[model samples]
Target: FEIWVEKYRPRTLDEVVGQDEVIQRLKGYVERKNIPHLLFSGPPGTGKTATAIALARDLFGENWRDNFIEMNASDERGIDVVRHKIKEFARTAPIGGAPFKIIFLDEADALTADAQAALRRTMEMYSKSCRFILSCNYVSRIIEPIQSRCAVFRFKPVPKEAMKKRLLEICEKEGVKITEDGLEALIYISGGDFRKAINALQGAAAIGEVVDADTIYQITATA
Candidate 1:
């Protein structure tokens, strides 16, 4: 029941909280049943990764496995691995009549300018076979050539109210009791990070079926 944050992370824009305008635009692309190369520029804890994966699921149907590749530049250590993985994934054509495979390059800004330039070239080389959804915290760090090629969407931090509402939803769904101080403490501690807030809530709930200010204080103190 706890750890429901990942379990209940939005599978589509409709399930995502806040960012209605951005969700609308992305949904429009999904409605058309086609999506171009995309760039999600924003902060962490935002829904960049979730949105990209949701779009893949919507556009390619349940068999999106055949059409999507998720790669993280920061996690991979170097651009060579990133490039190699993208190239290897793009080598195969899309299955199920999808126009092109999608490569989700997460933390795209982590690469050096030269490495990003190389990545840009990789995109061009594989453009015929793959469309890319690049995500990063700062779009300015992304190479201009790459920026010029993709449809960029900025992801913003979630509002405190939104986080609170989502936390309420989780509490109700899990039947956990929370006090005003407990919720306020959660918001303050999480600093508008929905992922962190939800994780904190899950951890608090793990102590008992009930969540009170005492348990909340202890969780924050330990965290």
Candidate 2:
């Protein structure tokens, strides 16, 4: 079965739940056709990655994929990858009418200090041709030099009301039956993590068309 989380993921900044302030500020940047290297620090499942992708999509239009590169720092957290793949990608000119390419680095805090130092230099050297969106759970783990070069946006966990509303929307679209008690249960189980709540909802839906509080508890218990 297809994963509901990816299938229903928001495609634009306006579709993102919560993080209104951040979304507004980012939209301003997009309007200007200019954006600084961005550092988004927050808890997991808080829409950081989605925001980055949305921003890229808005900026590059139909040619977004040609100008966007995504990498997980935790996959190879060292200066070598930064100097090689990242450096090469950054040096290339954007396709179509875009001003620059976007390199999104997820879990940026996983990079060692020395690696960050190297990345900082690369960021400076390639500022004219490329922009970066760095996502991390802890901003403090990133070196001061790297942080200084970017516009830092802090993300908070999804609010209960917002999360519940989104989940209900998902239920309507997917033809799943959900009760108020079950919705409340999902909110409690999520602990303000939107991704976890969605995953739990999808898991319960897989079992049957009708989902209830007990089913949410049972599916999330294993998660």
Candidate 3:
């Protein structure tokens, strides 16, 4: 029941849907075997974290998991995240043959100006051993110096048509039936976040195998 997001999440850059421009640029970095510090800014559930994982996969292949870690600034004290958690990981050499490791700092805009300064210094100090991929909802909240140290990518909301295509595919593979109105109900409530739409669909399906507009509305309490 909780499996759809991870089950359907694209495992490679080539499998990612939409964000065609961002995909193209990311592929270029993979081809060159070089990745600069990166900042991915966008609305939530627009594939920032997923794309970063895919990038790391292409860069390191089967051992990508060892080379990549995702840490959330909102999950810990900003200064400690920068000082200990990040510093300890960044200071170590990568376990694999990849030239550098990646630390994905999510919700980076949550950090204070003072902490962000320490983060900038850490980013510079660890340049030889690690790369930082920062993801946030707003770019303007990020300090100019930290932003300048990375190649930034902005992700846009997935289009309804593209989203529907993927949703239908998921349903078919999952042995669930979704009506047209059911699909519309999910999408309309989702606000273009594909992850939200999928979760709602899964929730509605749990209540009944044949999903309809009414079931979707009931699960979401928006009927």
Candidate 4:
């Protein structure tokens, strides 16, 4: 069975649920095929990763596979990875007619100062061949030099109504009969975190087809 989160993940900027202004500006960049190094900072489940992936796809189309590289900085946080793997990827020429390849660094705040310093230099040395999209929960942790080189976009939690609309849509599609109280419970419990809401919806649906406020509350409590 398909995991609903990945199944329902938005594939385009317009398909993304929130961050309207960010999507509009990114769309312009996509149209121009010219993007600056980007810094996306925000709370979790706020569409930062989704936006970066979608933008890369729109910018490069079928060539996105070759031109896009993604790494979780939190997992490989060291100066050596910056010097080796990143450098190796960035040093190469792009595969398609696209202007430059993209390197997406997720959880960038997890890197140490030294690693970031190395990354900053790498960004400069490879600017012509690589464009970077860095995602972090906190922008304050990134160095000033690195921050200054990028176009920063801050993301906010999905609006309540928007979150509700998307969640309800998903519930309907999944054949889950969610009562009004159940939907309200989800919205309140999620606190605008769409990822948690969807996960909760999935968990509740797994238990039974007819989900109510009590079912959601019990599922979330155990989780």
- Which candidate has the top score in lDDT? 2
Tens-place lDDT digits, model 1, residues 117-140:
888889899877788999999989
Instruction: State candidate 3's TM-score.
Output: 0.92
lDDT of model 1 at position 190 = 87
lDDT of 2 by residue, 68-145 (tens): 998887774366765678877876677887889999989889888977887788778888899989999998999998
- Can you give the TM-score per candidate against the true fold? 0.92, 0.91, 0.92, 0.89
Expressed as tens digits, the lDDT of each residue in 17-124 for candidate 3 is 778999999999999999999999998888999999989999999999888998887765447655678877776679867899999988889888887887788888
Worst 10 residues of 4 by lDDT: 74-83
Off by over 4 Å in 1: none
Clashing pairs in 2: none
Tell me the TM-score of model 2: 0.91
| Clash number for candidate 2 | 0
Question: What clash pairs does model 4 have?
Answer: none
* Better model by lDDT: candidate 2 vs candidate 4: 2
lDDT for each of the candidates?
Answer: 0.84, 0.87, 0.86, 0.86
Ranking by TM-score: 3, 1, 2, 4
